[PDB]
């Protein structure tokens, strides 16, 4: 009426709006995904954490205020930015900027799921995921922005978005959590990005690393990373909903086990050795063996709570698992050999394992001392850290037959004469071009899908060029134009310069030319 | 072989001069398809400009596109390929082609070749992308059928590689 | 106790903190502390918006503006690159050039929307307690607002899903943020409308907040027939991500959208005693102007005036505008049949009022978008085209 | 409840002992696990939820709950399910606290997670398949 | 190199932190961690709002509820106590009983008002860009809104200063927070009214945003004669801090304040095409409803029903209500003369529409306030007294 | 005009409102302080930090979010609450609570300055101070 | 600028020497000081303003500025006046930064302080009497 109405105070709660979200979609002929996909089953699922736009923003904004309060006010007043061990401060240059590209691709990957979903609730859900991955991009960006202002070496923190193009480690990062997501089947993104990427690997990559940062004086990374993963539980839930649709449809379920195995190997081939290396070698204080962190989060918990539970519904344990566990034990020690040997191509200052690091390595990985410890100790005796020594291990590697190859598929480096991880070198010639493959899973992918894996590797691009010329072209220097960003030690004196790199006479070869 | 610098080298300079002689849409269309058939995809004719062909191709695209807006009528930008073909005709022609392929190796070739020939600005973007998705759907399903059935030694023969080394 | 190590914090544990302090050099190792100092600032000095956003996309040199090199590690079946030039007709010398003038990275965007989120609920609790709905025109409320403003949420939802491929395909970071923010605001508009409908249901017995009548009107009523056609095309008929952003925000939403939200439901609300709807249109309108600023920079500053591809880009923008303006004119032509249902108010719902409203929308559109790309537009002609659908 | 310790089983072995079980034949395929793992980001609200909800009422209903101190976060593993009612946490903290305010510091979930009413749940059940 | 000492931090310095850790016992010395546990909670559980507010005032036992003892340390000349029972005619068994149902301590109060502060500027930047002002009725904008709505700002400003003695004199913490928050919301209303006039001045050339004409109208125009008189009395005529809060919020602002803001300027704005004023009155109405909840709890739950003094308090409230209702009825009678200046709209500005408006204000007040303290009131009689001022 | 209007994005800044603050007061016989004072001189002063209610809340809400982020998120995660020397932790019992009552009285003392002030800018300014002291009470 | 140090003059002495000067006859009445004291709360925004505004441009114009680290805040004392332009801090920080945002971390002032435009100013001048 004009005089009588119920004047009880009411609003509209988020779930009252979300109840009607499914009816926002309407049927027309062209209402279908724009992206290629093998998965054509019906996927009319419900978003687990019912979020509307306003509620999404109120929730995320509340996280930021607590986060930036801690960083901008409290930890700055404590001077926590320069209270990080150098080894770990250097590691965060790589970890943060590399994860940033993964968050960035995760935006795009989530958009495909957004495009390829049919339920209006999952479109609205995946847009929130798309927003989150933007948030995650700016969060990783903020760590390096924060380190750049308050940490004693801003170089590398301050410019990784171009200085990462110099080196070989960055290449494989462009696949593991990037091209591997966004360049393929859109509905399969629920398997590679979500069931494997988000459900499995973000836990050791984003959560477990927080304890390693705390152990090494870094309270910036936990403040930010722990807030990043609070978005991921919503992503896992949304991804699992689509996986249910695939496993319940016999036509599309015959594509699930294969895509799961390719996705798992795709991501572990790089994540396992690279993150293992950065944890154990890029820290002073260690939390636990990398292979136990992997066993806890990857093999047992994800393998059991996700893949093993789903085993009752046709989902097999990944056929590449045996090979992946072997990589979890040894591949990151293999990767360390290459990362230490090609240090001038990076954007971080590395530290050879000291006498107590070596004791730890040999205790948790028996055999490490005789195989890797001897090589590392010999590099130190040859002047690895001294800029006047004229010594860089990559040339030493070529002198002793320990040639380094780049996997045409995964971009992961491979030193077959030293590698203890899963691997064997297969060199094929096809249509006048030589290709080097390193494992049965990557080779099968290349043999069946060669037009997908045409990535130029560092040797093909740098062939015949002197090392210091490449570094200076790629802006791998500090502000004085001559001192390298990357260093083979983490002290403050005797930093290497461009002229110090030229003295070693290192020139890039064609590793496949001998074949 | 010693590589020149990455982003500015005599090889890129030389092709940019070659590209600047293009003065018609038909000339640039023949030039861009000859380029793509000879330097792109695993079935390229030559790897001599491996590290440069992608940049060079971009500059070819930029020349053909400008020529199209300068010379072609507006309706032709939307509905026809620069070859003169009807854009919609090219889509149905190539969709039915790869759908009639008998193996992943016939399928992958048809899809690769479609891109070599009709990648924009030859074919209108909207028509190209939805055709590329339709071809990619068919190529993806035939490849992910019995994906692990053929052993590697057989996959090497089927692919036709020369095995130079097996550790 | 516990099975694992309670690891000691290097920041506060006396032993680890002592080791750390001994290894941290007493001097900085470089003096460049500006995160990503090499970004070219659009404004007087580099903004935090630019530092956190620009060059996040790992583009190679063969996508204009990229700093990387080489091919992608993994491509689609057939060879479609992860990102590529084939995704849009438009060309540029540097895809990184774009800059949201609101300088929204994620944190300021959700901080601003959180405010609206919490204030809305307080406003709704007070409005219901005020009983201010008692003065609203019952016919406007039940027969126009409930049914037709509700049906408009499908237009907003359509424009929101138009961005899904855009979020996957576009070629730079600042564009991608602009797109994604634009999309969330659009599903928000759709959600805010249904929120208002659910709210009025709590205040007016018999007021049905179900979407069935709005959906039946959107999908069958000829009033939205032209609008639904245009939206379905922009959303699912094209994949050129630049064409989606342009046809969606710069043409359709700037003409039909602006007329439906601002000239009809918000203007007529203040003529039929509606003290509630303007609170919700105030948000969609703010969202529109903030999206326009970003959209206006991408297509005018960056693309229509690119030093090498400006005229080339205007050719495609002109053709797109020509096509989608006709779609929106026809959408408005169907929409002005709704004025036959409303109660006659002088200068608002009569022919002179609808003409003045159409002149404002097309007049503003000529200035804001058309004149900046060289598109000619007879405003009188467009107004009389739509007015032909007015009884 | 020792099976849900972070260092349960093989994690207790070192050196050759660990390597032998890790590379053992039977441990080359995943084993179905009935457990869930919930990671809670330490803060004033969470440290209050951990002590007075998860370890009091939560562990009474579910004796298998194991909570471990991981410096920056809490590691919780439990058989079956773990639940946290935002209403109960709000009464505990004296301030408004909806489900989304609870999700502010819920970091990781190994399991199926969803929110029903005011309750966040991480369950080992496979909704849609079971 | 500074003259003073760089103080080592006990939290991070290894030597001091070690000493600190050695001194801290390995166990808590008490298990009660609920801050001010002994507060009697009003709700199911004790709230942070109560923990931070309740018993902050150090009252002795001779002020009902106080937990302390003894006289004050220093008193006024002549002997007036720092706080004393002589400050109000009303009595209770416990002045600490009051509870804001919004549970506003300082932080949530400014957190909410900051959201409104930032969102308003965004809405105005967009509203200027929209050109939405173009459809507003010019006479309403220039001759009614600009002049008499701007004049209304002085009523709000006057109610704001009425709290100045209340903020010093009142006798408990939660009452003092209610009064002070209520006062800021009133000066905000005045400032917000002037903000809107400044905003319109930027969009409409010749629109004079100066306060001269509004002030002339507030101080001399018979339309606001009774309103100014009531406000000057409430603000400066009395010092009973309960009388001020009751007469100001429960009588004057609930009857005249509600009719002016909601029934006149807000409601008629949606009859004359004003898409801007309902954005500003939405805040003043939200503030009123929030103030009312706290005012209601103070005088109904606590004072009118106090176990020992409820009937005693109701005697004064009824006498106050009788007096200030007369002053407000007179203020409204003067106010409804402004309807002679507005262009007549059916059911809004005619005698029938003003009556339905008056029936709403007096009817809502009878339920919200009069019924709760036992004040009898014939609503039709009040409507007819005011309508005697309608022409 | 119903078609032509300046569509440049504009808002209204704090100082634009605060300029008109002095005119908000008007003259009547009883417009004086209610409290006893010896000081009956002209105090028509200006507020040196132009403050309006919306801006007051925005500024203080910004202080609060960083302070509570540090306490509830940062320092709690570091366990700093029990990293205080016992001597000093005990001292904060009386320092913070005694300061609390001083902040609480400052609410009322500012309200007296509010009432005794004659300039609308200082009346408004002293209400901002009254709120500040409520903030400081809840902070202690 | 030695007279504006925190431990200037009598603050240097200790024991009987400090006591002798503290209780000296000349030191039982206040002495007019032309200085001003500014206290800035240490935060990310303030650490940048200290280093690039107060100690660069500010110290160039006023060489008597002394900045002292006091764990949680910066203690600044200077002859005459100290001015900080929030507009200059906004450019430096690359984010919106009005004069009220500067005041977020401007704790204490010993002197006359005001906001003129985007500038905060603390001065030894006596506006209204001088
Ligand atoms: Fe204070
Ligand atoms: Fe992420
Ligand atoms: Fe994610």
UniProtKB/TrEMBL annotation, chain B:
Keywords: Monooxygenase, Oxidoreductase. GO terms for biological process: methane metabolic process. It comes from Methylosinus trichosporium (strain ATCC 35070 / NCIMB 11131 / UNIQEM 75 / OB3b). This is Methane monooxygenase. SUPFAM superfamilies: Methane monooxygenase hydrolase, gamma subunit. Transmembrane segments: none annotated. The keyword Translocase does not apply. GO terms for molecular function: methane monooxygenase [NAD(P)H] activity. The keyword Zinc-finger does not apply. InterPro entries: Me_mOase_g, Me_mOase_g_dom1, Me_mOase_g_dom2, Me_mOase_sf_g, MethMoxGammaMmoZ.
Automatic annotation (TrEMBL), chains C, E:
The keyword Acyltransferase does not apply. The keyword Oxidoreductase applies. It comes from the Bacteria. InterPro entries: Ferritin-like_SF, MethMoxA_beta, MP_mOase_hydro, Phenol_Hydrox, RNR-like. One of its GO terms (molecular function) is oxidoreductase activity, acting on paired donors, with incorporation or reduction of molecular oxygen, NAD(P)H as one donor, and incorporation of one atom of oxygen. Keywords: Monooxygenase, Oxidoreductase. This is Methane monooxygenase. It comes from Methylosinus trichosporium (strain ATCC 35070 / NCIMB 11131 / UNIQEM 75 / OB3b).
TrEMBL record, chains D, G:
The keyword Protease does not apply. InterPro entries: MethMoxRegMmoB (IPR054955), MOase_MmoB_DmpM (IPR003454), mOase_MmoB_DmpM_sf (IPR036889). One of its GO terms (molecular function) is monooxygenase activity. Pfam families: MmoB_DmpM (PF02406). The keyword Oxidoreductase applies. Keywords: Monooxygenase, Oxidoreductase. Belongs to the TmoD/XamoD family. This is Methane monooxygenase regulatory protein B. It comes from Methylosinus trichosporium (strain ATCC 35070 / NCIMB 11131 / UNIQEM 75 / OB3b).
UniProtKB/TrEMBL annotation, chain F:
GO terms for molecular function: metal ion binding; monooxygenase activity. Fe(3+) 2 binds at residue 133. Keywords: Metal-binding, Monooxygenase, Oxidoreductase. It comes from the Bacteria. Coiled coil: none annotated. Fe(3+) 1 binds at residues 103, 133, 136. This is Methane monooxygenase component A alpha chain. It comes from Methylosinus trichosporium (strain ATCC 35070 / NCIMB 11131 / UNIQEM 75 / OB3b).
